C-alpha cells in the first residue's frame, strides 16, 4: 500500500514541480505531493500567470480605448470592456499551463500524489486526501517546497468578497468604482494598474516612502511612481492604515494616518486589496515534532545544500530565505536536487532579477545605489533614456531609461536598473552580464542589433565605462 | 561653423573626414570627435542618418509595429481578450504620419549630437580629389576643400535595379516607395523574398493587400538564415495569408493601360510560364554598395566584382590613410555592423587594436513572429565539419508566450559537441530581436550552453525559452518540454 521513493517533494509550485522533474531526470524515483486541485502552485494558479494575463489584456484595452491606437491610424468607434471575456482569456492560459505540468510529470515518470502532505517520520511522508484517506510514502529524501501565503493585516479580515487578497483581486466579477490597495509593492502596483486601466478609481496606501518593494533603486522608483501618477494611479505614501470597516451598504471605510504625523483621514471604497506582503507556508507539516525550528519570519533554516538540520530533509523556494520569486524557487529546486546527486550547488542571489510587468515595465538585477552606498562601494553611473533609443522612438513608446552602476576602479557592472519598454526581457541580458563578471566596457562593445531596445543597455554601459554615450 | 552649407566655401583642415552620415559614418564621426580628432562629416542629402534612418530600418519598423497592432484590433486577437469594438478602420495617412514623426525626431537627434560633439557638418557631395583631400560640391554649385589626414568612406548602399523593370516609385516601387504608398493596394507582388521583402510584404498584407512574393532561390529570409528556421517561418507566414512562389524567376513586367501590372514568371530552372497581375510591384532583389563619383578610379582604388571597396583588417583601402566601412564594404549589410566597423576603424586611427568578430553580429527580421539569429547555422556547421548538438524549445511551452496567447515558433541552439560552446542561436517567435542580443553577449565570451541554462532568467519571460533550448542542447532534455 505505501509507496517507496528516492525523493518526495511536498508542493508543486515553481520550486517543487521543477525539482521533481529534475530529480526524475537524474534517475531518482520521485513523488510530488500537492494538496490543491491543480499543480503549479502560487505562481501558476493565483500568481504570476493570471496577473500577467490581466496586465497584458488591460494594457491593450488602454491602448484601444485611449489615445494610442488613434495616433497610429487605428480608428475604432466604440471600445467596450467585456470583463467576463477578459477573465476567460486569463483562465484559459492558467488551465493550459497547469495541465502542461501534469503532462510533464507523466512524461518524466513523476508520481503525482493528491493530498495534504505531512512529514510523519524522518523517512516518511503521509498525504491525507480530502475524504480522509491516506497514502504513505517511505522515502530516502524529503524536499519541502510548500511555498507561501498572503500575509494578513492585523485587524483587517480578508474575505475575498469586498476585502480581497491578490487572489480575489485577480477574479473580480466587475470593475470596482473605487478601489484601495494597502501596499505599493510589486503585487500592489501591478494589480492596482490592471484595475485602474479598466476604469476603477485606484489609490494605493503605503507605509514606506517609495513604490516597488524592497531593493528597488530609489531614482527608478520615484520616476516610476511619477509615470504611474500621470496614468491616473493615485498614491498615499508615508501613510499608515489604522483599520478598515465593512459597512452595511457593502462599502468599506478605510482609516489612514500619516505614517509619522497626524493627518487622520477616512476614505471609502468598493473593494479593498490587502497586499502588504507574503510569508512562508509550513502549516501542519510536522516540523515541530521533528525539531526543525523556524526563523523569526517563519522560514525554514537551511545550509548551502538546502538541507535542514535533519540532513535528508531539504527546503527550497518561498519557504526559505531570499527573494520570493518563481525563477529563484525554480533554481533552488534544481540545484538542491543536483546536490542530492552529489554535484555542486550554486545560486548567486545578486544575479537574480526582479521584474514589474506594468507599462512601463521595471526590472533590475544586482545592487541599487542605496545598497552600494550602504556597503561603501565607490561606483559610477551611466544612464541612457529610451527617448533617445531608435526602436523605442520608432514605436512611440519612450518612457524611462536604463541605469548602469559600475565599480569606480575596476569597471565591473554592479547593477542594472531598467524603467521602460521591454525591461522584463532586457534584464536577462543584464543577469548574464553579472553572472559573467562583465565590465561596462565589455557590454558597450557587444554588437547589439539595430534597432533594438537592448541598444539602450549598450549605451548606458558606454556612459558608465567611457563617460559618454554615442546617441545621447 | 559647425554647419557648412551652401555659401560656406572656405578651405577646411581636418584630422578625419567621414564621407556619409549613415549608421556607419555618423557614429564614426561622433566617436572620432570624442577621441580628440578634428572631425568633418560630409553628407549630400538634406538630412543625416543615411539609408537606415531615412528610408530603411526606422520607417520600416514603424509600419511593422503599427500594422501589427492594426491586425490585433481588426482581426481576432483583441476580441479574444474582451476588447470589443464596433468598427476598426485604417487611417493610412495617420499611420504614415506616425512613421514620419519618428524619422524626423531621430534625424534631428543626429544633428544635435554632431553639434554637441563639435563635428563639422558639410552638406554636399564629397569627392576625393587627392590622397589627403576631399572636395564637397554643394547644391548651389559651390565647392569646398577639406585637407585631411584621414578619409573614411562610408557612402553606403543603394537599391539594386532589375533590368527591364523601371522603378518609378508610383506603381513599380523600391522599398522607398513601398514605405510611403498612398493607399493599400488590392494586390501586391514582391520580387525578392529576403528580409526587406518579407517585412514590407507583411506590412501591406496586414493592412489588407493580397501579397505574393516571388523568389529565385528556394527559401525565404535571405543569406545565412538557418534552413529549418526559414522553412518554419515561411509556413507561418503562409498561414497568415502571405503567398510565396519560390524557385521562380521574373521574366518581365508590363504596366497596362488600366493601371495594373502584368508580371511574367517561370520556374527558375525550367519553364512553367505564368502571369500574375498586381496593382503595385515591389522590386527588392538586393542592395549594392554606392561609390558613384567618389574619385576611386583616379586614386586607383579598384572595386571587387560586386562593387565593394576592398579593405584590410584595419579597414584601410590600398591607400593607407583612406578607409572604408559599412554597406560599401564586404560583410552583412546591416546598420549595427556598419556602426561597429566605424567605431573600431576610428579607434584604430587613434592607435588601438582593430578586431570585430562577424560571427557575433546578429540578424533580425521584424515580422510577427520575429526571426533573429547569431553565429552559425546548421548548414554552416556541416559545411565546416564541426560536430555539434541541437537543443530546441517551442514558445508554445513558454509561460509568457502562452499567457499572452502568442506562441508561434521556437528557439534553436547549436552547441559544440566537445566543449558545449554556443556556436549558433536561432529564434523564430515573439521577442526574437531583443532576445538575440543575449546570445550575442554569450558568443563574445565563448560561453557554453550550460552557462546559459544556469543563468536565472526571470519568470515569466520569453527569454526562458532561450534558457530551456540551451538546457536541451547541453544536457539533452529541457524541463518544460
Ligand atoms: C499575485 C502574485 C503575482 C506574482 N507574480 C510573480 C511574477 O511575475 N514573477 C515571479 O517570479 N514571482 C511572482 N510571484 C511570486 C511567485 O508566485 C512565488 O515566488 C512562487 O510561486 C514560489 O514558488 P514555490 O514553489 O516556492 O511555492 P508556491 O508557488 O507557493 O507553491 C507551494 C505549493 O505547495 C502546496 N503545499 C503547501 N503545503 C503543502 C502540504 N503540506 N502538502 C501538499 N501541498 C502543499 C501549495 O498548495 C502550493 O501549490 C507572484 C506572487 C503573487 C501572489
Ligand atoms: C527598407 C530597409 C530596411 C532596413 N532595415 C534594417 C534593419 O532593421 N536593421 C539593419 O541592421 N539594417 C537594416 N537595413 C539596412 C541598413 O539601412 C544599412 O545596412 C545601413 O544603413 C548601412 O549604413 P551605412 O552607414 O554603411 O550606409 P548608408 O546608411 O546607406 O549611408 C550612406 C550615406 O552616405 C551618403 N553619401 C554617399 N555617397 C556620398 C558622397 N559622395 N558624398 C556625400 N555623402 C554621400 C548617402 O547620402 C547616405 O546618407 C534596412 C535597409 C532597407 C533599405
Curated annotation (Swiss-Prot), chain A:
InterPro entries: Class-I_Pyr_Nuc-Dis_Oxidored, FAD/NAD-bd_sf, FAD/NAD-binding_dom, FAD/NAD-linked_Rdtase_dimer_sf, Lipoamide_DH, Pyr_nuc-diS_OxRdtase, Pyr_nucl-diS_OxRdtase_dimer, Pyr_OxRdtase_I_AS. The modification N6-acetyllysine is found at residues 29, 67, 85, 95, 106, 309, 373, 380, 383, 468. Disulfide bonds join 43-48. Changing residue 445 to G: In DLDD; reduced enzyme activity. It holds the Pfam family Pyr_redox_2. Keywords: Acetylation, Cell projection, Cilium, Cytoplasmic vesicle, Disease variant, Disulfide bond, FAD, Flagellum, Flavoprotein, Mitochondrion, NAD, Nucleus, Oxidoreductase, Phosphoprotein, Redox-active center, Transit peptide. Binds 1 FAD per subunit. It catalyses: N(6)-[(R)-dihydrolipoyl]-L-lysyl-[protein] + NAD(+) = N(6)-[(R)-lipoyl]-L-lysyl-[protein] + NADH + H(+). It is found in: Mitochondrion matrix; Nucleus; Cell projection, Cilium, Flagellum; Cytoplasmic vesicle, Secretory vesicle, Acrosome. The record marks 411, 436 as: Important for interaction with PDHX and activity of multienzyme pyruvate dehydrogenase complex. Changing residue 451 to L: In DLDD; no effect on interaction with PDHX. GO terms for cellular component: acetyltransferase complex; acrosomal matrix; branched-chain alpha-ketoacid dehydrogenase complex; mitochondrial matrix; mitochondrion; motile cilium; nucleus; oxoadipate dehydrogenase complex. Changing residue 468 to M: Reduces dihydrolipoyl dehydrogenase activity. Does not affect interaction with PDHX. The modification N6-succinyllysine is found at residues 29, 67, 85, 95, 106, 122, 129, 236, 240, 373, 393, 468. FAD binds at residues 34-43, 52, 117, 146-148, 318, 324-327. Its main location: mitochondrion. Changing residue 411 to A: Reduces interaction with PDHX. Inhibits multienzyme pyruvate dehydrogenase complex activity. Does not affect dihydrolipoyl dehydrogenase activity. The active site is at residue 450. It is linked to Dihydrolipoamide dehydrogenase deficiency: An autosomal recessive metabolic disorder characterized biochemically by a combined deficiency of the branched-chain alpha-keto acid dehydrogenase complex (BCKDC), pyruvate dehydrogenase complex (PDC), and alpha-ketoglutarate dehydrogenase complex (KGDC). Clinically, affected individuals have lactic acidosis and neurologic deterioration due to sensitivity of the central nervous system to defects in oxidative metabolism. Homodimer. Part of the multimeric pyruvate dehydrogenase complex that contains multiple copies of pyruvate dehydrogenase (subunits PDHA (PDHA1 or PDHA2) and PDHB, E1), dihydrolipoamide acetyltransferase (DLAT, E2) and lipoamide dehydrogenase (DLD, E3). These subunits are bound to an inner core composed of about 48 DLAT and 12 PDHX molecules (by non covalent bonds). The 2-oxoglutarate dehydrogenase complex is composed of OGDH (2-oxoglutarate dehydrogenase; E1), DLST (dihydrolipoamide succinyltransferase; E2), DLD (dihydrolipoamide dehydrogenase; E3) and the assembly factor KGD4. PANTHER family: DIHYDROLIPOYL DEHYDROGENASE, MITOCHONDRIAL, DISULFIDE OXIDOREDUCTASE. This is Dihydrolipoyl dehydrogenase, mitochondrial.
Swiss-Prot record, chain B:
Changing residue 454 to A: Does not affect dihydrolipoyl dehydrogenase activity. The record marks 420, 445 as: Important for interaction with PDHX and activity of multienzyme pyruvate dehydrogenase complex. One of its GO terms (cellular component) is mitochondrion. Disruption of native heterodimer state inhibits primary dihydrolipoamide dehydrogenase activity and induces serine protease activity. It catalyses: N(6)-[(R)-dihydrolipoyl]-L-lysyl-[protein] + NAD(+) = N(6)-[(R)-lipoyl]-L-lysyl-[protein] + NADH + H(+). Keywords: Acetylation, Cell projection, Cilium, Cytoplasmic vesicle, Disease variant, Disulfide bond, FAD, Flagellum, Flavoprotein, Mitochondrion, NAD, Nucleus, Oxidoreductase, Phosphoprotein, Redox-active center, Transit peptide. Disulfide bonds join 52-57. This is Dihydrolipoyl dehydrogenase, mitochondrial. It comes from Homo sapiens. The gene is DLD.
Amino acid at each position: 500500500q505505501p509507496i517507496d521513493a528516492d525523493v518526495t517533494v511536498i508542493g508543486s509550485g515553481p520550486g517543487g514541480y521543477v525539482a521533481a522533474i529534475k530529480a526524475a531526470q537524474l534517475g531518482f524515483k520521485t513523488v510530488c505531493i500537492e494538496k490543491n486541485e491543480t499543480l503549479g502552485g502560487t505562481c501558476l494558479n493565483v500568481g504570476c500567470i493570471p496577473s500577467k494575463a490581466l496586465l497584458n489584456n488591460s494594457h491593450y484595452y488602454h491602448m484601444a480605448h485611449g489615445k494610442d491606437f488613434a495616433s497610429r491610424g487605428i480608428e475604432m468607434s466604440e471600445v467596450r470592456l467585456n470583463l467576463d471575456k477578459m477573465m476567460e482569456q486569463k483562465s484559459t492560459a492558467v488551465k493550459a499551463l497547469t495541465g502542461g505540468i501534469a503532462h510533464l510529470f507523466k512524461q518524466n515518470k513523476v508520481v503525482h500524489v493528491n493530498g495534504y502532505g505531512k512529514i510523519t517520520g524522518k523517512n516518511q511522508v503521509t498525504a491525507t486526501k480530502a475524504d480522509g484517506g491516506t497514502q504513505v510514502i517511505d522515502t530516502k529524501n524529503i524536499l519541502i517546497a510548500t511555498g507561501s501565503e498572503v500575509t494578513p493585516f492585523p485587524g483587517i479580515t480578508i474575505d475575498e468578497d469586498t476585502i480581497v487578497s491578490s487572489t480575489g483581486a485577480l477574479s473580480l466579477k466587475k470593475v470596482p468604482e473605487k478601489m484601495v490597495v494597502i501596499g505599493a509593492g510589486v503585487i500592489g502596483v501591478e494589480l492596482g494598474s490592471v484595475w485602474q486601466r479598466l476604469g476603477a478609481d485606484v489609490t494605493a496606501v503605503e507605509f514606506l516612502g517609495h513604490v516597488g518593494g524592497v531593493g528597488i533603486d530609489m531614482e527608478i522608483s520615484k520616476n516610476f511612481q511619477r509615470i504611474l501618477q500621470k496614468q491616473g494611479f493615485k498614491f498615499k505614501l508615508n501613510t499608515k492604515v489604522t483599520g478598515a470597516t465593512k459597512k452595511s451598504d457593502g462599502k468599506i471605510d478605510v482609516s489612514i494616518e500619516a505614517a509619522s504625523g497626524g493627518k487622520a483621514e477616512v476614505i471609502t471604497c468598493d473593494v479593498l486589496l490587502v497586499c502588504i506582503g507574503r510569508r512562508p507556508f509550513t502549516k501542519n507539516l510536522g516540523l515541530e515534532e521533528l525539531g526543525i525550528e523556524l526563523d523569526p519570519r517563519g522560514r525554514i533554516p537551511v545550509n548551502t545544500r538546502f538541507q535542514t538540520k535533519i540532513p535528508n530533509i531539504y527546503a527550497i523556494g518561498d519557504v526559505v530565505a531570499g527573494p520570493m520569486l518563481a525563477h529563484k524557487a525554480e533554481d533552488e529546486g534544481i540545484i538542491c536536487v543536483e546536490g542530492m546527486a552529489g554535484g555542486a550547488v550554486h545560486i548567486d542571489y545578486n544575479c537574480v532579477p526582479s521584474v514589474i510587468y506594468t507599462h512601463p515595465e521595471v526590472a533590475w538585477v544586482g545592487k541599487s545605489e542605496e545598497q552600494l552606498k550602504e556597503e561603501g562601494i565607490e561606483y559610477k553611473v551611466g544612464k541612457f533614456p529610451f527617448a533617445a533609443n531608435s526602436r523605442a522612438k520608432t514605436n512611440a513608446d519612450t518612457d524611462g531609461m536604463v541605469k548602469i552602476l559600475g565599480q569606480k576602479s575596476t569597471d565591473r557592472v554592479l547593477g542594472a536598473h531598467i524603467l521602460g519598454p521591454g525591461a522584463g526581457e532586457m534584464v536577462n541580458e543584464a543577469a548574464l552580464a553579472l553572472e559573467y563578471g562583465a565590465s561596462c566596457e565589455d557590454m558597450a562593445r557587444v554588437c547589439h542589433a539595430h534597432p533594438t531596445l537592448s541598444e539602450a543597455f549598450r549605451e548606458a554601459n558606454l556612459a558608465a565605462s567611457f563617460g559618454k554615450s554615442i546617441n545621447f
